[model samples]
Target: KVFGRCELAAAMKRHGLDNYRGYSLGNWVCAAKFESNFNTQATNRNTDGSTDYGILQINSRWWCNDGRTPGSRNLCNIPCSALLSSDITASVNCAKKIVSDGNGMNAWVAWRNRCKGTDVQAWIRGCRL
Candidate 1:
């Protein structure tokens, strides 16, 4: 997986994440940090045996919608998932859309508000995808 602080910073910029307070940046980094630590090839152990892969932790099963998996392959390729697309802007915008529920900063604000009233770490940890 591509990793390094520099790489992360570049990836952040690509995602229009110059800051973390606005919908533009929001808590996406926080979520990404929780998932793959921003590793594009991150994999997680699932109770069902299928892996939650990639920057968004998209499951291999969900990504199967593309049908381009390698011959007899059962794994999802993070880089190939349409969700990440190959364009950083597209990926970031789409990611923001998916998590923001079309409300943009509203979603982020809600999360932050919840954090203010409780444990920030727990807020992040308990967030539903």
Candidate 2:
């Protein structure tokens, strides 16, 4: 599902992504914009052979188990497919783990390049918290 800006922001807020692991809602929203454009069905393959999945693009390298990502850690204890749904439940939980695992939000480079050093508030502006 393709979510509107406010819709995605609201959903991520509902999932407790705001201020999660020191990252603000704007950061998360900006990351989602550059990562998958808020599309739940989005997926992308990396040169390392791992694939990114869902709105936040949880990767197979150390998050989800796709059974073919070389050494996928599956640290989230969820199948990669679980992130493809519009429910946002599995992706949100796994994202929490990814950031809370001592790595912070830098694991997603898109956030590093865009959301980290910018006025990210624009990404969540006008959204009802």
Candidate 3:
């Protein structure tokens, strides 16, 4: 119940974004399911970076140093790491905002399809997680 609908709505608005379009939500669910399986504290090391954390597998250093907000590069001080630090409903909403802002979910979509194929219903189920 932690990251449920209410939190997602709030996060979306907080980041000044609109509701997703098409398979945006589905694409999101597929990415998260394939990346971390809804695990908030998930982390993995990358050759170019130190490690990625949270449900979206966000690269901590990328956001930690640059941040996400009004003053950073493309509103950088947003601290995406904090956003993904949970498995609550907020996670879904947070994921939406992160990608809606042009973080590129295409790679994620391809990645998810590679694993689960084009299952929009299955993806929606992931969103409801």
Candidate 4:
């Protein structure tokens, strides 16, 4: 209920994510589009009993503590709730950590399947930068 491609892009850029770790703004925009459609509170349960959290859908299996998963890695040191808020700072920081770990946007299956190698400009068609 709160964001679009341009807004997301601007937010990401303001957060120092425009092209961090070898990924472009388009990559982040595309990932956010397919991962959660820019909905901050989005969540998805996976077949392996793992859950994805928030706008970028960071997985409970590795990134955040949702408290529903046992022995979760919590690599991002943030609660899953952090990702669900309209304030995206925590999610963006964790995403950067993930990318820095060498996953790039490939960390997101959504990116691998739908956003990779595409002209993501379609996402930012008509908004002020």
Candidate 5:
């Protein structure tokens, strides 16, 4: 969560994230920055009463359950709290699964609004990957 960009890139690579789902590492990094500012404990409540969880800002409506959110699909089968922990393996795995569902990183609105068509290589610049 509080990890540096280099550390993040390295961890992502170690977790089998290089070129994941046809998405560049830059995309993932950039999305994380815009969504959670690299903080795993990040959460945002929407006006609709839905909440986004963790580094990826995964939505409660379809990704995880936060108990208070109604109509939560919990598609990831993991609690939203799990994604807010320092250990992001579960979060990362869920993200990969989301992308593999044929939407790619387009599943994240942050990716579309911030990283799409932008020069995102800077997200990984200076990383020791």
Candidate 6:
């Protein structure tokens, strides 16, 4: 499921991201915009060669396990495939875990490089949040 901007904004806040961890809906929306363009099934291979999955592009090397990343911790505690589901619950939970573990938004390079330290309010501008 590829969610449009405002649509995804509503979905994100609907789940748990409103003021989550001191991050605003704009932060989540901005991060997701760059991470996977809101495509639930998006996947990419990191230059270091690990796989990334889902909207946040959660990585296989640390967050989710894949034999491709050999000895990965699978910290999200579910198969990487689960992150590809159209339902955002699993990925949302994993994202929160990533942040809760003290990684904050640094866990995603796309977020750090593209979404960080910016006025991300425009990302969710018309979302009514």
Report the C-alpha displacement of residue 112, candidate 4, in angstroms.
Answer: 1.0
Clashes of each: 0, 0, 14, 0, 0, 0
* Local accuracy of candidate 4 as per-residue lDDT tens digits, 29-48: 88998999899989999988
Off by over 4 Å in 3: 1-21, 66-75, 79-81, 87-98, 101-103, 107-117, 125-129
Where is model 2 more than 4 Å wrong at Cα?
none
Q: Residue-wise lDDT of candidate 5 within 20-86, one digit each (tens)?
A: 8778888888998899999999999999999998988998988888898887798899999999988
In candidate 5, what residue range of length 10 has the lowest lDDT sum? 1-10
Error of 1 at 7 (Å): 3.0
Clashing pairs in 6: none
* lDDT value, candidate 1, whole model: 0.46
Q: Per-candidate TM vs. native?
A: 0.45, 0.94, 0.54, 0.93, 0.94, 0.93
Residue 11 displacement in candidate 3 (angstroms) = 11
Residue-level lDDT tens digits of model 2 in 12-123: 8898998887788988888888899989889999999999999999999988899898866889999999999989889999999888877698888999987888999898
Model 3, 59-79: lDDT tens digits are 444343323223323223455
User: What lDDT is reached at residue 69 by model 2?
Assistant: 88
Off by over 4 Å in 4: none
Per-residue lDDT of model 6, residues 7-125, tens digit only? 88888898989779999999998999998999999999877879999988888988887678866788888889999998898889989989888778887788899989899888987
Give the best candidate by lDDT. Answer: 2
